[PDB]
A paper describes a structure:
A commercially available crystallogenesis screening set was employed, obtaining crystals under a number of different conditions after overnight incubation at 20°C. The best diffracting crystals were obtained in 0.2 M MgCl2, 0.1 M Bis-Tris pH 6.5, 25% PEG3350, then cryoprotected before freezing. There are two monomers in the asymmetric unit and the enzyme forms a tight dimer with predicted surface area of about 28710 Å2, with buried surface area of 3980 Å.2 Each monomer can be divided into two major domains. The large domain comprises residues 93–313 and folds into a sandwich of α/β/α comprising a core of seven stranded β-sheets with only β10 being antiparallel. The large domain is flanked by a small domain composed of two subdomains joined by a parallel β interaction between strand β3 and β14. The N-terminal subdomain forms extensive interactions with monomer 2 of the dimer which is important for active site formation, similar to what was observed with Cv-ωTA and Pse-ωTA. Unfortunately, all our attempts to obtain the structure of the complex of Pp-SpuC with PLP bound were unsuccessful. In the case of SpuC, the catalytic residue Lys289 is located on the loop between β4 and β10. Another disordered region of Pp-SpuC are amino acid residues 154–179 and 313–324. The homologous region 154–179 forms a “roof” above the cofactor binding site in the holo structure of Cv-ωTA, indicating its importance in PLP binding. The active key amino acid residues which constitute the small binding pocket and allow accommodation of substituents less bulky than an ethyl group are identified in Pp-SpuC as Phe23, Phe89′ (from the other subunit), Tyr154 and His155 (absent in the Pp-SpuC apo structure).
Residue numbers in the entry:
A (entry chain A): 34 to 153, 180 to 314, 324 to 452
B (entry chain B): 34 to 153, 180 to 313, 324 to 452
The structure:
């Protein structure tokens, strides 16, 4: 366990003066990067004024109402309400209660089952991970097939027994599973046929991570509920939320947020907008990040490099043609260790190395990342 | 009323300069009172060095670890572990899954049912509310009966099918339901007979509210799990948690946001180093309970009850029968007068309730009860 004494921009400094590039932005959290005093001052001002309370007695410009309006401004069309929580985990619980409450109010209490994906009361369908699970199929065909497994499960369970499909636009913690380009159009086509709610888990994809405001923007999804956290405050203060489409909010309405967290969240969103951090990540940072990341495709250890927006993944293989793994050898952990010893935070999911840098990472910092990553891929192979 | 421009000690100031005594401590949470700059500085400091992280990389003295130890320091017995959450509600969600997981890992997956109380997979037993439900029984005899309904319900569901009993030591949001003195002794007798977990809901009672550190302390309860929030940070930043007994944690074994934890750590340090819990018990609570009970002569008041830093006033139409102005919205009338006259009291039905900041002074207690009596006058005159 290394002791950090400073954090600024994309870098940590440990107690030994070693400078570390944080390629995971905290835990997918620190969108604007470390050391933005403005977020400190927003928490300090709100805590010093009136630390807590709402309705009957409130401050002049309550940050939560302004936060919700600002969230709905950058959210997909029709997403008009926001219910705030203390965390992303509390958000995903809140959302699953909302879908079942929604159907109960609609007079359909049998609509109880949540369909989710492997590695993403509850039933599961295959995740759209071509690299590990697609075999010799084309990405396009494996994406259509995986999406088709949602329809099968809806009919197997029974539409009148299904409440909702829940999914991250891109599975984060499961290994930056970027689906084939056929996947989401096919899922939309299936969702169009069935009276079930679609929950977009945007706790990782939300607030700039794909180059759009939300992963739902990236894939033109029209979810009914979106769970958010993390990037919402750039991780400076805990907070989650559920964004709700107008029709759903209308049903739930007939049958909130802490001010200090909301003040951090409002200021974090304002910075992302007024400094065009999201837009510049899409147009300037991500093109450089993805081109330079894939330059590692030549490495003997790298079976694949994938990524879009500010997400990236590097697969560690034993043979490239067959996409096999150094089974049992804990290659991911070994690579991660060398990463930590050479001032680079990547995380390992299996033998997948994943990165999600702060959105403000510069080209020069991207050069530092891919340089340190190749450096540790050599160290890993040599160690094997 | 409406726009608040300054909050200090036990008072809020609106934009026209009216000083309002917050008799509810935010919503049961502002234990140390408003305007404590130490908590601001703790959050500010922790936010600017490193905002967030877990293992592999950590700050020099991670606040969550110290806070766990500080909490267990003041917690009962062998409450050894703390698991942090973002809120009290998340804490209560976590504790219900913790008890069910505990019995799964022990190979008893049928132990699923949670026993709660009315006004507190789920089954309910009567709340120990003598004023509203005891009729003509003595409080002592009503309290025994209410507790005995816990045994009946365990046996009715079947011990093998019950995971846990969950209760606040004193129901807060339900209207400060202070039980008869015989209730918790009889409940402990019952719990001692059956192999179920006991969850004390301490979101409201924790961190000094009863004059002890916890409601479990006041009634010498030995819960297996305790849910906490609110006073833990004095509401300056949201946080919740679950304190776990050693035997539960050992089975469950087989992290909290650093800024929230840094605020909770300094808030706990203040409650201890300035003896705020102790002085509430020995100085503020007796004065408060005394002056509150002087309202019992008011024609509208059917009962004053209270212990520690909790208080309740029952508004009745007829004292002897304990009857209510049915349908006439009396509690809401009274609360509106309170707000207009610089006093925040919550209404639950026709009970007015208070839970002031623990630091409230005798002068401020005088202020509260002068204002309460004025509004009891205004309420009865409007009726």
């Amino acid at each position: 366990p290394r002791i950090i004494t400073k954090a600024q921009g994309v870098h940590l400094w440990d107690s030994e003066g070693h400078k570390i590039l944080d390629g995971m932005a905290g835990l997918w959290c620190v969108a604007v990067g470390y050391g933005r005093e403005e977020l400190v001052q927003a928490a300090e001002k709100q805590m010093r004024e009136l630390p807590y309370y709402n309705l009957f007695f409130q401050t002049a410009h309550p940050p939560a109402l302004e936060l919700a309006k600002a969230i709905t401004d950058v959210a997909p069309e029709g997403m008009t309400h926001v219910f705030f929580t203390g965390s992303g985990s509390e958000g995903n619980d809140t959302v699953l209660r909302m879908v079942r409450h929604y159907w109960a109010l609609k007079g359909k209490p049998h609509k109880q089952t949540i369909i989710g994906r492997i590695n993403g009361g509850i039933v599961h369908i295959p995740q759209p991970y071509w690299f590990g699970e697609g075999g010799d199929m084309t990405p396009d065909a494996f994406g259509i097939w995986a999406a088709e497994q949602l329809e099968k499960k809806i009919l197997e369970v029974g539409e009148d027994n299904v409440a909702a499909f829940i999914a991250e636009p891109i599975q984060g913690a499961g290994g930056v599973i970027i689906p084939p380009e056929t996947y989401w159009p096919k899922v939309k086509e299936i969702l169009a046929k069935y009276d079930i709610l679609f929950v977009a888990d945007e706790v990782i994809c939300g607030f700039g991570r794909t180059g759009e405001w939300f992963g739902s923007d990236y894939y033109d999804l029209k979810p009914d509920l979106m769970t958010i956290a993390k990037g919402l405050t750039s991780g400076y203060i805990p907070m989650g939320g559920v964004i709700v489409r107008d029709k759903v909010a209308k049903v739930i309405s007939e049958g909130s947020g802490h001010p200090v967290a909301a003040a951090v969240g409002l200021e974090n969103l304002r910075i992302l907008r007024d400094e065009q951090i999201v837009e510049k990540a899409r147009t300037e940072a991500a093109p450089y990040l993805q081109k330079r990341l894939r330059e590692l495709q030549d490495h003997p250890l790298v079976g694949e490099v994938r990524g879009l927006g500010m997400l990236g993944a590097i697969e560690l293989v034993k043979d490239k043609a067959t996409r096999s793994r150094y089974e049992g050898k804990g290659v991911g952990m070994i690579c991660r260790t060398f990463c930590f010893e050479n001032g680079l935070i990547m995380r390992a999911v299996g033998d997948t190395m994943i990165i999600a840098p702060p959105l403000v990472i510069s080209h020069a910092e991207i050069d530092e990342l891919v340089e340190k990553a190749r450096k540790c891929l050599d160290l890993t192979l040599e160690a094997i």
